[PDB]
XYZ file of C-alpha atoms in Angstrom:
344
model
C 31.048 138.983 40.263
C 33.083 138.902 37.060
C 33.488 136.724 33.947
C 36.915 135.901 32.547
C 37.453 135.124 28.842
C 40.292 132.735 28.029
C 41.582 130.815 25.032
C 44.545 130.064 22.791
C 45.489 132.694 20.175
C 43.794 132.890 16.744
C 40.449 131.316 17.668
C 38.795 134.707 18.187
C 39.159 134.927 21.977
C 40.088 138.628 21.868
C 37.358 139.272 19.298
C 34.811 137.627 21.608
C 35.902 139.969 24.383
C 36.005 142.994 22.049
C 32.634 142.000 20.640
C 30.973 141.484 24.021
C 32.697 144.481 25.614
C 31.825 147.269 23.097
C 42.747 148.242 30.820
C 41.851 144.636 30.007
C 38.579 144.963 31.909
C 35.227 145.839 30.419
C 31.491 145.579 30.865
C 29.189 143.253 28.981
C 25.503 142.825 29.642
C 22.968 140.227 30.759
C 19.822 140.374 28.644
C 16.626 138.728 29.770
C 12.994 139.830 30.040
C 12.739 143.080 31.996
C 9.885 142.837 34.560
C 8.066 145.401 32.427
C 6.070 142.901 30.400
C 2.825 142.808 32.406
C 1.682 145.766 34.490
C 4.982 147.597 34.503
C 5.745 150.487 32.167
C 8.298 153.406 31.643
C 10.920 152.372 34.214
C 13.601 154.843 35.368
C 16.729 152.599 35.440
C 19.890 153.538 37.316
C 22.178 150.567 37.707
C 20.984 148.969 34.478
C 19.205 149.781 31.225
C 15.802 149.314 29.660
C 15.483 148.193 26.043
C 12.439 146.871 24.164
C 10.926 145.060 27.124
C 14.305 143.552 27.950
C 16.605 144.091 30.917
C 20.275 144.713 30.146
C 22.074 144.196 33.475
C 25.828 145.066 33.422
C 28.549 142.494 34.217
C 32.333 142.783 34.557
C 34.377 140.981 31.916
C 38.130 140.370 31.770
C 40.283 139.717 28.693
C 42.331 136.909 30.273
C 45.658 136.438 28.497
C 49.980 136.981 33.335
C 47.302 134.269 33.472
C 46.298 135.432 36.960
C 43.652 137.679 35.440
C 41.344 134.724 36.109
C 42.184 134.489 39.832
C 38.995 136.336 40.876
C 36.754 135.109 38.092
C 33.390 133.725 39.146
C 33.263 131.937 35.808
C 35.125 131.589 32.586
C 34.076 131.565 28.959
C 36.575 129.327 27.188
C 36.692 130.218 23.470
C 37.830 127.413 21.172
C 38.235 126.796 17.461
C 35.219 124.758 16.286
C 36.803 124.174 12.880
C 39.700 122.525 14.682
C 42.036 124.059 12.117
C 44.251 125.567 14.835
C 47.273 124.170 16.711
C 47.535 123.980 20.503
C 49.918 126.940 20.300
C 47.398 128.528 17.951
C 48.805 128.178 14.418
C 47.318 126.671 11.177
C 47.018 122.882 11.028
C 44.886 120.260 9.293
C 42.904 119.203 12.355
C 43.167 119.574 16.115
C 40.288 118.454 18.311
C 39.138 121.457 20.417
C 38.213 118.950 23.112
C 41.897 118.664 23.768
C 42.465 122.405 24.360
C 39.565 122.249 26.785
C 41.332 119.600 28.777
C 44.582 121.573 28.531
C 43.082 124.647 30.218
C 41.401 122.331 32.722
C 44.640 120.797 34.079
C 46.459 124.128 34.287
C 43.803 125.553 36.621
C 43.655 122.294 38.539
C 47.370 122.101 39.213
C 47.594 125.835 39.928
C 45.125 125.449 42.881
C 46.743 122.164 43.867
C 50.225 123.683 44.055
C 48.996 126.424 46.375
C 47.643 123.771 48.775
C 50.389 121.162 48.313
C 53.387 123.500 48.599
C 54.004 123.980 52.304
C 51.111 121.625 53.015
C 52.958 119.857 55.850
C 53.528 123.096 57.803
C 49.916 123.778 57.409
C 48.370 120.526 58.581
C 50.203 120.622 61.888
C 49.689 124.341 62.556
C 46.104 123.312 62.815
C 45.959 119.820 64.307
C 47.189 121.141 67.631
C 46.123 124.752 67.267
C 42.874 122.965 66.466
C 41.961 125.486 63.766
C 38.877 124.987 61.655
C 40.127 123.157 58.590
C 37.540 124.713 56.341
C 38.450 128.225 57.545
C 42.187 127.647 57.230
C 42.020 126.321 53.669
C 39.457 129.018 52.870
C 41.802 131.751 54.044
C 44.691 130.125 52.258
C 42.759 130.119 48.982
C 40.733 133.277 49.767
C 42.710 134.883 46.966
C 40.845 132.966 44.284
C 37.308 133.496 45.549
C 36.796 130.404 47.717
C 34.109 130.410 50.535
C 34.463 128.545 53.748
C 31.214 126.964 52.484
C 32.807 125.851 49.215
C 35.574 124.233 51.245
C 33.088 122.567 53.570
C 31.160 120.981 50.686
C 34.154 119.852 48.675
C 35.594 118.091 51.693
C 32.215 116.643 52.603
C 31.785 115.406 49.047
C 35.114 113.559 48.972
C 34.930 112.137 52.505
C 37.959 114.111 53.572
C 39.052 114.339 57.220
C 39.068 117.338 59.522
C 42.639 116.404 60.447
C 44.676 117.754 57.528
C 47.753 115.684 58.490
C 45.717 112.702 57.270
C 45.266 114.228 53.771
C 47.227 112.552 50.957
C 48.475 114.050 47.674
C 45.649 112.241 45.928
C 43.293 114.009 48.309
C 44.839 117.351 47.495
C 44.693 117.105 43.697
C 41.173 115.663 43.906
C 40.183 118.411 46.314
C 41.786 120.968 43.999
C 39.794 119.734 41.001
C 36.593 119.861 43.012
C 37.339 123.479 43.921
C 37.953 124.441 40.304
C 34.668 122.876 39.220
C 32.808 125.115 41.663
C 35.109 128.209 41.789
C 36.170 128.331 38.152
C 33.151 126.922 36.315
C 33.153 127.644 32.632
C 31.174 127.815 29.459
C 32.766 126.861 26.187
C 32.332 129.097 23.162
C 32.907 126.952 20.061
C 33.893 129.982 17.991
C 34.115 130.364 14.209
C 31.108 128.041 14.049
C 30.015 129.716 10.797
C 33.133 128.270 9.154
C 32.416 124.844 10.644
C 29.959 122.078 9.856
C 26.976 121.062 12.014
C 28.724 117.694 12.373
C 31.863 119.279 13.799
C 29.902 121.466 16.198
C 27.426 118.795 17.345
C 30.327 116.451 17.987
C 32.149 118.755 20.379
C 28.916 119.753 22.101
C 28.051 116.093 22.694
C 31.479 115.009 23.895
C 31.891 117.930 26.292
C 28.333 118.148 27.615
C 28.890 114.684 29.046
C 31.937 116.068 30.885
C 29.936 118.769 32.644
C 30.551 121.540 30.106
C 28.045 123.770 28.338
C 29.064 124.342 24.700
C 27.605 126.922 22.359
C 28.513 127.611 18.694
C 29.615 131.178 18.112
C 30.783 133.738 15.530
C 32.651 136.489 17.334
C 33.832 138.452 14.285
C 30.156 138.618 13.274
C 28.630 140.134 16.390
C 31.526 142.556 16.576
C 30.517 143.795 13.161
C 26.791 144.220 13.796
C 27.831 145.536 17.186
C 30.305 147.977 15.540
C 27.303 149.003 13.677
C 26.538 152.075 15.730
C 25.411 154.156 12.923
C 24.525 152.137 9.769
C 21.765 150.007 11.460
C 19.587 148.348 14.228
C 20.955 145.431 16.327
C 20.230 144.264 19.900
C 21.641 141.672 19.786
C 19.878 138.416 18.960
C 17.258 137.956 16.192
C 25.272 146.434 3.126
C 26.730 143.143 1.956
C 26.712 141.825 5.504
C 23.431 140.085 4.693
C 25.681 137.033 4.667
C 25.860 137.167 8.450
C 22.078 137.433 8.269
C 22.224 134.270 6.188
C 25.263 132.265 7.307
C 24.121 133.239 10.789
C 20.475 132.580 10.167
C 21.567 129.051 10.722
C 22.161 129.399 14.509
C 19.515 131.999 15.395
C 22.125 134.526 16.534
C 25.860 135.103 16.870
C 25.926 132.848 19.912
C 27.889 135.381 21.922
C 24.903 136.686 23.844
C 23.752 133.111 24.519
C 27.058 132.193 26.136
C 26.916 135.189 28.505
C 23.330 134.441 29.530
C 24.276 130.794 30.222
C 27.157 131.894 32.424
C 25.053 134.340 34.482
C 21.695 132.541 34.707
C 22.806 128.908 34.500
C 26.394 128.338 35.600
C 26.266 130.840 38.427
C 22.484 130.488 38.659
C 21.872 134.195 39.199
C 18.323 135.571 38.988
C 17.275 139.217 38.521
C 15.519 140.881 41.498
C 14.215 144.441 41.997
C 13.840 146.206 45.388
C 11.273 148.984 45.689
C 10.043 151.433 48.327
C 6.452 151.183 47.261
C 4.822 148.023 45.845
C 13.083 156.166 47.623
C 13.673 159.341 45.540
C 10.547 158.644 43.504
C 11.771 156.627 40.525
C 10.148 153.340 39.501
C 12.072 150.030 39.456
C 15.401 151.945 39.899
C 17.764 149.035 40.582
C 18.239 145.384 39.723
C 20.393 142.855 41.517
C 21.774 139.512 40.414
C 20.941 137.249 43.369
C 22.089 133.674 43.783
C 19.185 131.221 43.721
C 18.361 130.376 47.333
C 18.682 133.999 48.377
C 15.989 135.569 50.522
C 14.679 139.120 50.779
C 16.928 139.804 53.737
C 19.847 138.877 51.477
C 18.464 141.367 48.978
C 18.515 143.951 51.802
C 22.272 143.557 52.324
C 23.029 144.062 48.654
C 21.502 147.517 49.102
C 22.992 148.406 52.495
C 24.311 146.951 55.769
C 21.658 148.624 57.945
C 18.761 147.724 55.681
C 19.908 144.148 56.143
C 20.454 144.541 59.857
C 17.187 146.293 60.636
C 15.301 143.798 58.452
C 11.795 142.937 59.570
C 10.034 141.434 56.556
C 9.321 141.764 52.848
C 6.355 142.054 50.506
C 6.065 140.433 47.073
C 5.338 143.454 44.849
C 3.548 141.047 42.531
C 1.363 138.894 44.772
C 1.005 141.934 47.026
C 1.290 139.765 50.121
C 3.811 139.346 52.907
C 6.487 136.749 52.185
C 8.131 134.311 54.577
C 11.593 134.983 56.003
C 12.794 131.839 54.350
C 11.249 132.874 51.040
C 13.412 132.081 48.047
C 13.768 134.892 45.537
C 12.445 133.695 42.188
C 13.524 134.891 38.748
C 12.377 138.473 38.170
C 10.778 139.092 41.560
C 9.698 142.658 42.639
C 10.126 143.224 46.376
C 9.421 145.722 49.176
C 11.889 145.686 52.078
C 10.808 146.735 55.568
C 13.563 147.610 58.025
C 13.688 149.247 61.441
């Protein structure tokens, strides 16, 4: 899993990456309540990090800007100019609705996917109508390079009443199918950056307009968190809650720099990942050693495979290290679950 950061120049896109990442790849973090707010205490973390009762789980991040750095992205954070004082090409102007740069990015990803399907698409439909290939699998392989599942393909098709016989697919079907793939394969969160220099009216307007279109929009001040981040000597940040007291003030207005919020919304909401911790006793003797981002709907056996092939293969059953009782095989991992895996 990895998050790509995209945007036009001069809206703080690079700053957002720099800020959240402190060659073009880095590691940011997913902060939520670490299980150790109940009975749990002094954890010995290995794949993550403990911090004031909060779990900081690492996540790959890419400075996308050559725009095939997004190809494998599970999600994108699209940084835009909330003040709307930037041109499409990214240069000073009186007013340019960010909502239009959002759509710009949108169509480029849509047609990119569409061209891969469309180009050739005749000498694909017939290599499969007689060879009888599985349409889902064939498209899936063909777009395997972007991160598409045979399940994603199955659903998209199912959702748009498309036929198993590709030769019956029209161009309209292709573009529509492409868009549906983007929505699921390249979901994004919009960072309305430079919010501090914008009015509540400007921000609220873009949030409203775009949240109706299926986009999550959060105000943000990248330059700010980079500062208090790039405070690793002169003072204590986390980050959420000397003349930089202005950021304390002019960013007392949002409750934070917004950067951290965007990353949590991508991980926990967009992708719907939930933290889960596998134990040996509800191996080498450390407590709550690892944490895994599981997709909601996962089961303990799925948690077994994240650890190792055999654990998953020799799976017998699991125990909820909280309830202390044996779970079902169809049990759905819930946010922040502690689990014991039993394998032959």
